[PDB]
Write a protein that binds this ligand. Sequence first.
Ligand SMILES: *[C@@H]1O[C@H](CO)[C@@H](O[C@@H]2O[C@H](CO)[C@@H](O)[C@H](O)[C@H]2NC(C)=O)[C@H](O)[C@H]1NC(C)=O
Ligand SMILES: *[C@@H]1O[C@H](CO)[C@@H](O)[C@H](O)[C@H]1NC(C)=O
Ligand SMILES: *[C@@H]1O[C@H](CO)[C@@H](O)[C@H](O)[C@H]1NC(C)=O
Ligand SMILES: *[C@@H]1O[C@H](CO)[C@@H](O)[C@H](O)[C@H]1NC(C)=O
Ligand SMILES: *[C@@H]1O[C@H](CO)[C@@H](O)[C@H](O)[C@H]1NC(C)=O
Ligand SMILES: *[C@@H]1O[C@H](CO)[C@@H](O)[C@H](O)[C@H]1NC(C)=O
Ligand SMILES: *[C@@H]1O[C@H](CO)[C@@H](O)[C@H](O)[C@H]1NC(C)=O
Lengths: 202, 202, 202, 202, 202, 73, 73, 73, 73, 73
Amino acid sequence: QRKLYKELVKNYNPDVIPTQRDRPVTVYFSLSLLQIMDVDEKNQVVDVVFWLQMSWTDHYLQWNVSEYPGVKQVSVPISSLWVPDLAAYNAISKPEVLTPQLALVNSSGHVQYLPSIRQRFSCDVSGVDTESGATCKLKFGSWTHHSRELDLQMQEADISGYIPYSRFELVGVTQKRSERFYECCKEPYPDVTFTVTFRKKG
Amino acid sequence: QRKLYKELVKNYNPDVIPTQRDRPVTVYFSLSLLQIMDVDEKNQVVDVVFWLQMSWTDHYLQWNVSEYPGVKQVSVPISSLWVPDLAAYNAISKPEVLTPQLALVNSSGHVQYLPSIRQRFSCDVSGVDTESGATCKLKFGSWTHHSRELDLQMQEADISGYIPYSRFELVGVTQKRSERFYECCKEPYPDVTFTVTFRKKG
Amino acid sequence: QRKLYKELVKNYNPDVIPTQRDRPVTVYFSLSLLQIMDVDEKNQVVDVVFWLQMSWTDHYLQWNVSEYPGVKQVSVPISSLWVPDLAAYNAISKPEVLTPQLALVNSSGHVQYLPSIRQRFSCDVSGVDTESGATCKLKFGSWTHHSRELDLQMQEADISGYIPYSRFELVGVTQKRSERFYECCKEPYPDVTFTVTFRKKG
Amino acid sequence: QRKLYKELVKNYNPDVIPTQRDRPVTVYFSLSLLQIMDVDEKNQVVDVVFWLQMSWTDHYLQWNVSEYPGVKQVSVPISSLWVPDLAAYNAISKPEVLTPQLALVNSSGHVQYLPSIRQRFSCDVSGVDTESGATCKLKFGSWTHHSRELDLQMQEADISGYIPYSRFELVGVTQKRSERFYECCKEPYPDVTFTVTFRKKG
Amino acid sequence: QRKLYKELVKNYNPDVIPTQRDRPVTVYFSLSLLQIMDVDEKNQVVDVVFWLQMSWTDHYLQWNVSEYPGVKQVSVPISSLWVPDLAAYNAISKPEVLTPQLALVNSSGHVQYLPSIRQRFSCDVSGVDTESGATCKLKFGSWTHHSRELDLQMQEADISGYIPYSRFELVGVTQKRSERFYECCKEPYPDVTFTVTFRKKG
Amino acid sequence: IVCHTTATSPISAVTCPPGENLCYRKMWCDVFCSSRGKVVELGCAATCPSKKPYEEVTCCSTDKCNPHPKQRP
Amino acid sequence: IVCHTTATSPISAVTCPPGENLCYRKMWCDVFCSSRGKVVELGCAATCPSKKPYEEVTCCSTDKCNPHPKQRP
Amino acid sequence: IVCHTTATSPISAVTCPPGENLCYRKMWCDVFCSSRGKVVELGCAATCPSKKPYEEVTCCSTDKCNPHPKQRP
Amino acid sequence: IVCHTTATSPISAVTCPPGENLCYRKMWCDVFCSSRGKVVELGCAATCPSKKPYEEVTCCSTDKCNPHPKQRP
Amino acid sequence: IVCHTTATSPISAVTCPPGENLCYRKMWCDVFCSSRGKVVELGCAATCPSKKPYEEVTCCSTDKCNPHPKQRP
Ligand SMILES: *[C@@H]1O[C@H](CO)[C@@H](O[C@@H]2O[C@H](CO)[C@@H](O)[C@H](O)[C@H]2NC(C)=O)[C@H](O)[C@H]1NC(C)=O
Ligand SMILES: *[C@@H]1O[C@H](CO)[C@@H](O)[C@H](O)[C@H]1NC(C)=O
Ligand SMILES: *[C@@H]1O[C@H](CO)[C@@H](O)[C@H](O)[C@H]1NC(C)=O
Ligand SMILES: *[C@@H]1O[C@H](CO)[C@@H](O)[C@H](O)[C@H]1NC(C)=O
Ligand SMILES: *[C@@H]1O[C@H](CO)[C@@H](O)[C@H](O)[C@H]1NC(C)=O
Ligand SMILES: *[C@@H]1O[C@H](CO)[C@@H](O)[C@H](O)[C@H]1NC(C)=O
Ligand SMILES: *[C@@H]1O[C@H](CO)[C@@H](O)[C@H](O)[C@H]1NC(C)=O
């Protein structure tokens, strides 16, 4: 009854961002910091783990609830369908994905993708021992698309889930969306900056 | 003859979970901790090796014992057939599989996969020097399926395969299954938590 | 709508440098040093991160703005189209690309690629503590092509991207293009040497 | 001349063990320890390098010496033909193969594969400083096949070829084959245990 | 135009060594040591970088200078054509290739492949601090071929491209070819041993 | 007093045991709380369970008044 | 005084608020400044904003005199 | 007294040697004991072998009373 | 005095400037010197350039006497 | 005295030089000794070469008495 798969990826090319023109693919960002692995005061960098919520609507992917007997949603590997080319601007090391490369999809076309990631970003950690604490900004954003091609809207800033017994204690978490125009491209470049401040417990 | 292989993967798509509706794919979990590589009291993490028992029944994979001359079982690479999208929730590093990527299959359709794995999980190891010992919980579970799509039932909790001369001594091992409902999906979410307590010998 | 993709890579072979007899593929280089990860005075080597601006014109890739309804530019994976075989002559470790493997293309045929890279190069860092500072030369250039096959023209540097709070402070950045003729091949060999001098802050 | 290749891998599937109705594929094992990289008394593990002699007879692979003009043997990549799913039971790290992935083949069907490997195994190295020396057992064996599917026969290993200037000195090497019956499968499970004892020179 | 590519790899199988009965494929070796990364007196091993010159003549690869409009040479990826199965006999770690996987080819059939490599070999470095200096022998050679199938001839050794500011200073470099017969195969087994002696500067 | 309980699977309607006349619903917010939703809990208690900082409690007396957020009272 | 502002998306033409009679354009040069171009900023100010070492300011009085480098005054 | 022995391959039925009139079965539990199952051993002994903490012994007198867990007595 | 120079691309024949009546060719040997060949240099000089240990100089007076190793004098 | 030598390729029959009247064959056993076979060496010597622990020497006087293990004396 799962002929759906064979059809879903029939005339589908994952290298093409799904837009009906005029209307840009809107992706909903959200970072759920899990734990702060380590901090290098010497080279100014932080090793961190975190779930990363990503969801959009692929107009190509969608099926008639009837033509398919009780097929609510399906788990498809991120390589079979399109996915936002998000990039950790201030990252200094290839992102190590821990969780399976699988994304869910609504019969309507809503694609939900949340991968577990460990990665190191460039950041000032000199004031991590001070009670004031050091702060890091994890700027994310499409790498080859702008507002007219792909809009990046944030939604949930989940502080919950951070390891309780971590040597570091979160004093504050700020997730904010923001745009910026460059000397070209009438359209602006949307980016979500996940700011985090933390001190050393004890 | 072995025409079986060519047939088994004829109309088979490993991206599709073999559910028969009103018959969720039930997978039997089981962890056989081999040895505790190391513990990082600084960043709270444990490096551990372990055999991972996984077995289910793929209704697609199955052959007539007759049509095939003396073909009891066959070794097929995990990439050719479907496999549970299990994920080590509290893990903080991509799982390094040591053993070959092969799985056995019953002429009936019973698939068995046993991958040797080394991986580090987030855990409090501060009380590892105390005679009471520190404890780690290795929570596993489907990352994109629930009770109605894939049921996760545990099995035996074999510890016997633990390294004797290890610098650490196991004081107790608790493998328990458990469900958890969320603000959605009438169906619950199954996961097996392999708990382990250990102290430093001598 | 996006039949373009299927056509663009129809009679295209990425192993062939897109040249039109009497005219060599001219590639525009540009390095935007992001941050100096570390320096090993012991083995003489520097760990550095940087953005790599690369742009050329593939005569094969190009479409009629009309035949295609509002298709300005598209994001194609570097593996689908040809790309300069640039190599870090003085590098001592495989280049770790951090950003997605995508490049933009003009309907005219202008291809642009901006990959984020981390890599270590052989360099004297003995005088990094002195106020005069140590200097490193990052020589880049084709590996199997010369001036007649592929011309390498630079487009000035961009130190405006360096990381402030870095333990090191840039005292000067020199990006210069240069050719070299060998005992063979009438045509020379263009290479761009990105020179950088830096001292230890404080 | 070499149409052989195109024919050899015509109706051949490397995922199928070359059994012939009651003739289990017999593989000849043999380990030639090259050098003992290092020993970790802290976590009990040994880093070792060694050539691994493996040879069997693939009934599928074989050609008429006549039909092929002077074709004695050919070098085929291990991925093109079947190969024993041997696994280092007590290993704690993925095997790093140093030599090329090639294997020779007799016109009769005799396949030979000698891969250079570096790998770390779990082992007690506490008594490595004592004149008595510490001992390690490198147990190998099929991971999904038994005596009826694949028989594992050994042949005395070679102590020679060991680094004469190694910080460690071999006091004895014992390579022995052995079987074992489990609560299942009437057929036993063969395995070759390469035992090695060594002390610290000087 | 460049139909050459499509033709060159039409009836070509890179797994087959290009031999013409009585005319074994002769490959010209040459090592240009770049720099000595590090030395481990503890485990006796040297980390070194070096450009490795390799050139042979593939009778399959060759085109009529006329039939092809001004096509002197082309850059083809080493995976498309055959390449010597050279192996670093005394190496203790998989070779990390730094440069692109490309090789040039003469319209006549002369193939040239010079990849940049970093790798660690087993070697006595105990006398590296002495003014006499320690010496390392990097033995290379076919892995599945002998004199009748593949002859390995060397050429001019290089010490020109060695990094001056290196903590180590080369006192001598000896590149010599040599054969070795075995209890089988009337034909010998060639190999090129690149010997290098170096002391610690200052 | 009939209630909804998450102790059984699937969530069934068990008759809130003696002494306990209040059906409740407590919802946490873990890691998956961003995608899967807030953790759902349904049970029985004589005295309505106290709310924790991040938690969210809700009690009642009506039968089947503490259903799953995706059902009907 | 009508001006061009980058505070809204897309860049629209807002009537430079009271007190402010000068439209301006400030351009930085960040990391992407090598490919995407110099950062573009358009707004209002009574007193023309001061130029910073790396920055580049430009003021005027005409209506819509501070357009995007890819538009027309 | 005829018994089942694991000393031969496949497991055959050898006549339990003189002095020994008891067939037995000892089962260990190693690493593979989680997938392959408990180690199986079948042999002969005058005096029923003693049970070790983790081991599991079983003796009898009937002929072929100590078969493989996957066979019939 | 007409000479061959490597200062221009491709290597053209420039009239060796005043004071300089000698065309020359200096060849180094770098890393690629094993495959690409010895570095080639062609220019002008009043006094023939001195040879360095690894270098290789060659001077002359004839016109176009210092061509590329792959050309004709 | 004519002998077989491994100093030349292929292994040819050289007339064992003056003073030396014994043809020999020494065989080692290296890494490949498990597949390729024991190392083969053929030469000349006045005094038969001494055997080393792992080595294996063999001398003679007859002409071509020290052939390759895959040939005929
Ligand atoms: C090389 O390619 C040419 C085509 O350009 C082939 O055809 C003719 O070859 C002869 C050689 O005797 C030339 O004299 C002709 O000029 C070629 N074309 C014609 C018909 O004018 C040639 O066979 C190919 N191989 C050779 C011999 O070089
Ligand atoms: C099983 O085997 C036969 C072939 O002999 C096959 O056609 C059918 O599915 C089954 N037949 C029976 C009744 O065994
Ligand atoms: C461009 O495409 C149109 C079809 O819409 C065609 O009529 C026209 O001739 C083409 N001209 C070009 C740009 O070559
Ligand atoms: C696209 O425009 C032209 C197309 O002819 C091209 O030269 C340029 O590099 C591309 N980028 C621009 C200017 O947007
Ligand atoms: C082997 O090949 C030769 C020549 O093709 C033929 O005469 C002979 O019958 C063949 N025998 C086999 C092994 O089939
Ligand atoms: C093939 O090689 C095997 C192993 O060395 C040997 O037993 C057999 O006789 C050989 N047969 C031939 C010559 O093909
Ligand atoms: C072309 O091939 C010849 C072989 O005769 C040799 O000079 C070299 O390999 C190549 N030379 C060129 C034209 O670069």
